[PDB]
RNA sequence: UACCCACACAUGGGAUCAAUAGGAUACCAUAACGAUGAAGGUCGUAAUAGAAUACGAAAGUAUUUACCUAAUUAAUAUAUUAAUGUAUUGAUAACCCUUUGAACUUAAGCAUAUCAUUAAAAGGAGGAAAAGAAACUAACUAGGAUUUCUUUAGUAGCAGCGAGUGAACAAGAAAUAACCCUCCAUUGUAAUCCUUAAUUGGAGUUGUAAAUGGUUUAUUCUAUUAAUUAUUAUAGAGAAUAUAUUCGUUAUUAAUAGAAUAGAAUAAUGUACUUGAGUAGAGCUGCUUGGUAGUGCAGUUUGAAUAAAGGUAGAAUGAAAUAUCUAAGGUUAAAUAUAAUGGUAUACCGAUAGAAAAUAAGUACUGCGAAGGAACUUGUGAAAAUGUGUGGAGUUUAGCCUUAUUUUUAAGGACCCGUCUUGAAACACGGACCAAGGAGAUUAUAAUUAUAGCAAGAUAAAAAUAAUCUUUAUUAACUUGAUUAGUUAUAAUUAUAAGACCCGAAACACAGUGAACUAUACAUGUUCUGGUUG
RNA sequence: ACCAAUCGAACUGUGUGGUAGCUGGUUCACAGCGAAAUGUCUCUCAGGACAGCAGUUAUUAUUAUAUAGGACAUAGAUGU
RNA sequence: AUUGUAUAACUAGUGGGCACAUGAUUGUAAGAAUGAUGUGCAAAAAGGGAUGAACCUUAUGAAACAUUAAAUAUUCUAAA
RNA sequence: UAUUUAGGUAGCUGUGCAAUUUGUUUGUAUUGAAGUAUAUAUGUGAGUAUAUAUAGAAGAAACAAAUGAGCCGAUCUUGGAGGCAGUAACAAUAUAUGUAUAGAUAUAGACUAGGGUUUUCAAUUUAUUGAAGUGAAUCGGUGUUAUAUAAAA
RNA sequence: AAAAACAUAGCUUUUUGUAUUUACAAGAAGUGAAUUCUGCCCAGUGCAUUUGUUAAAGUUGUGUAAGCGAAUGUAAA
RNA sequence: GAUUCCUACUGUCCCUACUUACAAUUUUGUGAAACCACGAGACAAGGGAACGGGCUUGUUAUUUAUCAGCGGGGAAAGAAGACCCUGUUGAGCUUGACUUUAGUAUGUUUUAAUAAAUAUUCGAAUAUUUAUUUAUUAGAAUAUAUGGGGAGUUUGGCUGGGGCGGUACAGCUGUUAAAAAGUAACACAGC
């Protein structure tokens, strides 16, 4: 130490104990593989299933939405299922969450009308994979990214603007 | 470091390096732990923790394949990486679509007997030796020079150019480096297809234009 | 890769130990001979493994165009020795010469041992592979 | 004759160059032991047999399996009537869960601290194990079981406040699944359970309750065996022979075993209001954590309430409001970690290298014992050290530099190299001679210089077909507040930590072996012959 | 004194490539430039850090209307 | 007298010194110990003091020709 | 266009030669590649190029890349071979015809502990190979115990 | 390093009456055969015997320990 | 066992001489080691790291290339000096060194039920003591004292070598000190 230099922190046991990443490559190859293979055994259903969409906790993203786990069950009340029945269904439901606004209750009720109108149902396993439908493999539905919006206002309601 | 040797000390009219104990052989009382002794292990043993992989940003890896895919259309460039381009009719050239339609070898080849190119075909097949190195024991053996490449639009290579030597395909998403300019130079003789050809419009936009495929790419301007 | 492992590679080294190390119907086939013209079109096939008494016919090598039968087989070495062949000993020439049998085209065969058997078993099998093809 | 030099030819030795049925590293699959006798050992069997290698009196090419060995006519326990049946015991050297637990070292000394919730040691299971359905996180317009990756972050904090050590929520992803006992289950009836060929013999009211069919057809995937492949080419990957041929590659089928999905047919459907005590918490005492006056655990004393009730909300106690949850009984797939064993590849080494071993290598050989542990491939034939023949000088002077056809002599110059040192030819240390080997390379974090892309913005984070920096804007806080072109990479140098340019102590801790030499106690055996005195 | 040729704490394996302000060694050519053995602090005196002496690269001209280990003219300080 | 001057950034070695001339302190004295000013050896070639780290002439690539300094001219040994 | 500058230990910077492997381009070889030994030319120097003999199968150059990347020394590691030197230090009974006549030194023979074929014979020169050889009711062990594993007296 | 060192009988002091063993016994120390002697000192340090200072836990609250200090003996300590 | 004197006795001595055996000297056979910068001839004086085989001025040997002796020199060979000093390197041992601990002594709380007596505090609470059988494995958790029987570690610097003595180890004045500023000594006179 004969110089300028802030003071340096580095710890003893630093290198003696290492985890190396070699198998990258490989793994995501694995990975891609069993997920293309579940996918022959359930051939009419989709892959994934339906989620809700929530809030963000804090002040930092406050101004953010994003799909959350599971779906109320007063919420399925509303659109008409059952949660034994929906669950046959792809779709999720949890029940450890509570219930707070009425804004968050009519946003979660018309996404179960339009998830219901897509689907159809046929009779037994031999009727389903005779039919070639294609098969949709992303997520199902998502939230998509915004994009601010500036309003012009006249010159006279700026003195009484809220 | 598999032994458990241990210095004997000094009043003994003998060096201070680590000695192998015991008795009853030539082995015993001779040197080890040390580099510079016969069966020892070496200062500064080699590890895996090297780095063995390199970062480059994203902007410039696109310039370089911009580049040497126009260094293709030069006539100089082409000729000073040692092709025999004299008899062929124009460059670049673009082939017709319906050209995976075909399922044997022979009828490949007569493609290329069409036009004015068989000599890089057999300039490729004379030119194999010997590797000089100690490579030749290590899947190295042979040596040969590098021929035409053809740039097609499926997603799955054409079994009926495979055999022919001397000739390499490749599909136009990908767009590798390694053939584009091989050797650090660039120039190689390149044939297009219809449908692959037409699609570079798309892929790269004019001078004020952005590409739609590529998101946050311009070409660069003229010095 | 311990003896007789029959792999897919490309290294010089692996390729070497299967030949050298090679044992049972394995050991046949790689000393095998090429057939006449004449005898291609009474069976089909292209090639098939040697055994002894039947005449053979050199076309390469520097005893080319001699023919013989074949008198002893070696499968330690992969060699054969062929009739009307001499080779110089230290003492005299009349050590019989000894040949790698891919050099080699037969012209009669010899029927011993199921020979028939055999050859019947293949030019059946062989028609088969054709008409799966159309 | 000996001593010295020059040339030519022969001995001695295994360096250089070329090859290779050997090794090293990374990835993928498997993850199969044992009382129905394992792993390991001793002795035997070949027509002429020693080493190596294979095999058990059926013995050197689908059954048998000599003798020890957990080694078992047993031991610790349960069931029926001293006998019989059932279950456990041994091997491991990587990953997993508990118990016990150091010191060398760093602080330029050392005693709290660090190395360290480490090494050694003991117990217990599986192909994975452990964990897992809130007596949670927060203060928002609120989220939602477990596990793993990126980031927050070398941050809040802890500490002779010294050296040093060190978390979580929110946010982006991989993968997703929830359930069962504990009351008073229709008392118009134990409706249950083990065993027997048999309501045969029991268990059970101090409370047991357990629906059943494997037939056939089709499809997909994995593993092992067997077969056919042009000489134009769905075959230019590679080997072998000689100076134009084969095995394969490529591309197709068959047989056996295992797994999954679907159809048809055969079997089968009653009633069910349970919530966890010598626990949770207090006083004294010891260990652990970043947890600061419990973050978590344990010994001793004491020991409650039952939804009109109880717990928690990052300084202490007492009190109050507002939020948000309900402990002390049980099961659970996937995403994740890594050996023995078998495969595939490579900018790795090429016989003083690569594993200790190109394998008659854990072999020969050493030690009372725990234990220690080498040399040797095939062609070419360097130097050190010698032999024979021919030629030449002198007896007073090795080798080197300069100038000269008196160059096997003459005149001048000239102490032996490396190294500490004010100062070395030194009576200062190392070096008799040749060959081969042999010491500032790698990684993390910062900074300056050169180069490249974009620029008020910059980016290959994990993954799949967000964050950080410019700029936490100051202050302990309240009160307050515009401004120095950056960020991402490639290369060289320097600083700190890693074995850290290479070789070198006297010592300390953990786990084990010796009274054949010699010392002491106990048991059992053996211990030659002649005189003196009194 | 003795405990297997070892005894004022035996022998074998591991932590271990234990720590050393202390001895020893550190491998190719030419060209440009070129030192210190002094001051302060230190459980400091066989060792460290800051200052001094050195090297490399860079930008810029009235900071030549300027500088100097010099001299001359003028005004002064001192107690050998 | 000087064609430049001025300003920044990064980084190494060294901190055991000795001798001559002038002048001092302690000591009977010392090739003894410790300070002050200048120049050297360390790190500096050739020629002369017979020989010598510091004395006397004297600035630096490879050579040839003429002139001197320090010192010398019986002989070794160039020069009455 | 140096008529001006050029020594140098510790130390700092620039231009260049040698070795192994990787991508691209150009070329050599059975009328003879790589290695080794003697000469000649060339470079201020690290070095390079050619010629003759020997041997018998693969090696060179240019533009870029990766380092286990250049020895006289460490009482350095492993192998081979010198001087001193044929020097120190040790061994050395008589017979003209003999499986004998003499001389000389040393007490000898059985059980146990330890050794394991050394025993005996044949053939070839304290060696090498090949055969043969160990016979128990009465000679040892196997039995009893030394105040919770003990006797070849 | 074989002695002038160690041992020895002889002399003396001390602890134990709940010993698998029982005071002519079982543990701990110093001098060194026999003969003749073994003087004075308890202030210091130790050892033994006997009636100001001092912790925690418990109770509505309060109180109580050994040890140290003081007194008396003891030098073949 | 350690020390002195008489008698006898003698190569211990005056002062050495002669004989024999075994090694040695001569021949054949088996056939090593320490050591080695270079050693090619040796001396007198000089200077020099203050005792040269080599450097500078002087004086000098030589049997055809030997054999047997001898111990002046090569500051001769063996062993990284045991004596002395330094190191912020160790180990055995002692104690009124620093910090602690096994063992042991004494309190408090836990301890079978029952009845009675006595004492101390205010009908009640404490304490002491006796008797019976219905318990009786014999211990556990904390506090104070004793504790080289044990366990870790330390035990400054300057200095005409270290130790003993002094502090020239922090402040102030005059002289050393040489007419600007700056300057040493276990030097001077003091605080
Ligand atoms: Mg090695
Ligand atoms: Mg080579
Ligand atoms: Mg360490
Ligand atoms: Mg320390
Ligand atoms: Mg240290
Ligand atoms: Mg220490
Ligand atoms: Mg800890
Ligand atoms: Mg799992
Ligand atoms: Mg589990
Ligand atoms: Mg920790
Ligand atoms: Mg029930
Ligand atoms: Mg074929
Ligand atoms: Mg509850
Ligand atoms: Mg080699
Ligand atoms: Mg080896
Ligand atoms: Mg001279
Ligand atoms: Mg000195
Ligand atoms: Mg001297
Ligand atoms: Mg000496
Ligand atoms: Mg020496
Ligand atoms: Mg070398
Ligand atoms: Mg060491
Ligand atoms: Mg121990
Ligand atoms: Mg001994
Ligand atoms: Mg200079
Ligand atoms: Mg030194
Ligand atoms: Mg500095
Ligand atoms: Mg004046
Ligand atoms: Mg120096
Ligand atoms: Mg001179
Ligand atoms: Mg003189
Ligand atoms: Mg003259
Ligand atoms: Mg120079
Ligand atoms: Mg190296
Ligand atoms: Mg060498
Ligand atoms: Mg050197
Ligand atoms: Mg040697
Ligand atoms: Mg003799
Ligand atoms: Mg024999
Ligand atoms: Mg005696
Ligand atoms: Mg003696
Ligand atoms: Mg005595
Ligand atoms: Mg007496
Ligand atoms: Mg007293
Ligand atoms: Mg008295
Ligand atoms: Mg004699
Ligand atoms: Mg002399
Ligand atoms: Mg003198
Ligand atoms: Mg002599
Ligand atoms: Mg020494
Ligand atoms: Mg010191
Ligand atoms: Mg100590
Ligand atoms: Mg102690
Ligand atoms: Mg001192």
Known sequence: MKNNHILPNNHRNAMKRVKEWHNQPSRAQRRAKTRSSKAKVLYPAPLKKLCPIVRC?????????????????????????????????????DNRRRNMNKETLDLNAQRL???????????????????????HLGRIMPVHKMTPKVEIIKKAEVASYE | MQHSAVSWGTGRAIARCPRIGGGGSRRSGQGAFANFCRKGRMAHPTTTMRRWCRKIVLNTRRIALAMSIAASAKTSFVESRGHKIENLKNIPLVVSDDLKKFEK???????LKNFNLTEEVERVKNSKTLRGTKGKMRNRRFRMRKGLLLIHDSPVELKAFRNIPGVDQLSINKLNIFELAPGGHAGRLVMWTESAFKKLEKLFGKFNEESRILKKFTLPKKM | MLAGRKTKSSLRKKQRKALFTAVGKDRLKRMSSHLSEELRSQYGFRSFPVAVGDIVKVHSGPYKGKEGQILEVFLKDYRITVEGCLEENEEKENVPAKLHPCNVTFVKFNMDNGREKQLEEKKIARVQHIEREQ
């Open chain 1, 57 to 93: 906790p804090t002040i930092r993203y406050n101004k953010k939405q994003r799909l959350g786990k599971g779906f109320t069950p007063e919420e399925l009340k509303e659109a008409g299922l059952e949660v034994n029945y929906a669950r046959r269904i792809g779709i999720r439901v």
């Open chain 1, 113 to 135: 009308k339009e998830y219901l109108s897509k689907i159809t149902i046929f009779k037994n396993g031999k009727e389903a994979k005779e039919s070639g439908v294609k098969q």
């Open chain 2, 105 to 111: 070898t022979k009828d490949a080849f007569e493609l």
